[PDB]
């Protein structure tokens with residue numbers, strides 16, 4: 108029933124106790140205690156205890172720290188000294204502007220920047236499944252993401268839920284050794300930590316991102332891995348009917364912030380369970396309103412990292428993040444043409460398995476070969492290969508040369524003459 | 535080793551047996567047997583350069599319409615075997631029917647969350663993405679009974695192919711097609727769970743060959759509904775050379791990586807441009823990836839998808855389609871003046887944006903409480919309820935024309951302040967808004 112609000116444990120409470128919760132403006136909401144850890148009370152909202160909301164200790168000094176799901180140090184450092192104590196439920200400060208997401212976030216991964224571009228303020232889930240490398244892709248984006256040319260500084264907030272010890276040490280090591288830590292706040296919730304902390308983890312993370320974005324004028328990228336495990340924690344506390352509204356209190360929290368010098372961008376990982384007997388398939392579609400990045404078993408089976416299939420992927424806001432002054436003027440054309448040539452080449456793989464390879468026409472054979480060049484040169488890149496959008500677009504142009512120039516129906520002749528390697532002038 | 539073909543069994547055969555096959559075009563192929571049922575052999579052919587067989591054929595005639603057949607094209611309806619005009623091979627090699635033209639123009643399914651916001655166009659492949667326990671079967675059957683091509687000079691037909699189904703489901707589909715009269719414009723292929731696996735593998739090939747024959751030889755727009763590609767894949771991963779082999783590992787046969795493309799290649803406008811083959815495949819998320827790895831179904835998703843949402847199912851709403859993750863990539867080629875109506879794109883864009891905003895505000899309401907939400911936000915919050923209750927919700931038997939759909943859209947859009955309709959041109963507000 109009713110939505111979840113998190114409260115600091117200041118006095119003992121009982122199950123089903125009726126309580127008041129003090130909101131950031133001095134008003135109070137009433138609810139009932141649902142559960143609690145030793146330090147955090149979970150309240151369902153509709154003489155008596157009046158509770159304070161659970162707070163994040165907020166400071167620019169959160170950057171470079173690795174913390175638990177409850178905000179406590181996990182890196183052997185001192186507790187955070189706060190500038191502000193901010194309600195993590197999201198209710199003390201409305202940082203979001205009524206503005207659409209826009210302008211480019213360069214992940215350095217061609218199958219996102221090139222064909223499915225992430226924009227500032229967007230929520231763009233990675234949609235994956237058991238046994239696929241969504242975790243490596245999330246960490247690669249956390250190492251590589253930037254906002255080319257932005258006057259606002261950039262930060263990452265990386266929140267991992269229900270993870271093993273082994274995973275935790277791997278994530279800490281990767282952030283530390285690459286320097287990615289120095290612009291990040293990292294929240295790690297272990298599988299064995301109290302379960303209440305698992306559901307507080309993304310609220311801590313989004314609070315930190317809102318504080319950096321709005322009070323320090325930053326574009327902040329929040330990567331949340333992964334929401335299925337968060338759904339699991341609600342279930343443990345089919346999925347509960349209130350889960351769909353609860354998820355909305357996570358996916359409402361994204362966008363450009365007031366003043367438009369900062370933004371909160373989310374990339375949640377939505378992984379489908381590999382055995383629905385023990386882990387039922389949750390409906391996480393509420394999070395998918397601005398497109399998705401699809402991690403595909405076919406590509407992984409073929410030994411290609413990252414195994415992202417651009418055809419089912421989409422970024423509904425891409426056009427607000429690309430072109431002259433953002434990426435390059437020819438970006439939309441090249442994206443459209445690669446998409447169309449790869450879709451045609453893939454259908455032609457079907458055709459070769461109907462009529463045989465030697466029956467395909469010479470033109471069809473160019474498109475068949477293009478689908479292989481696309482997967483081998485454009486989709487495939489190294490774990491630590493950080494490609495600028497220029498790099499991405501020039502790979503695109505090189506593999507597009509395999510097609511007959513007269514078959515480039517998605518590219519304006521003005522871009523063919525300016526950028527196609529057969530016509531472009533050396534400057 | 536190349537393509538898989540399907541052959542009339544006339545004697546027992548062994549695995550990997552070399553066979554000569556007379557093809558539908560009169561030429562001969564040599565190939566190796568992979569598997570068989572009582573009456574069908576699956577053969578992988580060799581390029582160019584013992585048992586001699588003929589290919590399994592569809593008995594193609596316009597008199598397939600009105601008939602209920604098995605996966606192999608045998609009658610299920612107590613009628614006589616089809617009398618063929620032509621006997622066509624079924625693997626996709628027959629006819630060479632497809633044009634190099636883009637899909638376009640409207641198919642009216644009568645369901646608003648398809649036509650209104652994610653429009654199906656002639657020649658498109660638009661999958662329904664769903665999961666166990668959701669009503670994807672009912673949606674597939676509703677579109678089969680309701681679909682048409684408004685204003686087209688070409689005749690319309692449905693090919694409905696159901697794979698791996700129970701006897702009770704088969705009984706229900708027969709009754710439904712018969713009782714509503716949808717049968718007279720349909721060919722129905724029913725494959726049962728306990729029919730041979732190889733018959734399940736042939737089932738979508740029979741169906742697509744019938745659709746290509748009616749589209750290309752008879753100038754029809756044909757809508758092929760395939761339910762469920764997941765159950766097709768669960769048969770495929772146990773057939774022939776795939777048995778107990780693991781995707782991505784040595785021993786897994788190359789043809790497994792291209793089989794589903796032999797189904798999804800088979801759609802489009804046909805030569806002559808008087809007809810077309812449109813597919814609505816059902817892709818149910820299987821739930822058992824660990825124990826039954828199948829070919830990746832994502833290859834089927836290139837022109838959008840219709841997403842069936844358990845949230846909406848649990849709220850009591852049918853059809854429980856969530857338009858926000860749903861997409862039709864070819865929608866703009868099927869809408870607007872002379873296809874649907876000139877305000878269609880604007881109304882869809884505005885519904886989509888208000889619904890997405892309202893759904894975000896269900897999160898903000900939970901964060902701050904209803905009493906704290908602004909008057910403007912409350913109107914959008916309410917709009918997402920009106921969208922779900924009035925536009926998404928429609929009856930199983932309710933066939934809305936596109937005009938019925940746009941009119942419901944306008945009505946619910948009057949709940950928003952007119953100055954908040956930023957995706958609708960003023961020309962359209964004055965012409966079509968209920969207050970003007």
Ligand SMILES: NCCc1ccc(S(=O)(=O)F)cc1
Nearest residue numbers: 850851852923927928929930
């Ligand atoms: N808001 C209630 C209106 C309504 C309308 C139809 C149904 S149903 O039984 O067909 F699912 C349920 C509720």
Ligand SMILES: [Cl-]
Nearest residue numbers: 175176177179
């Ligand atoms: Cl902790």
Ligand SMILES: [Cl-]
Nearest residue numbers: 346389390844
């Ligand atoms: Cl669910």
Ligand SMILES: [Cl-]
Nearest residue numbers: 404405829830
């Ligand atoms: Cl695969």
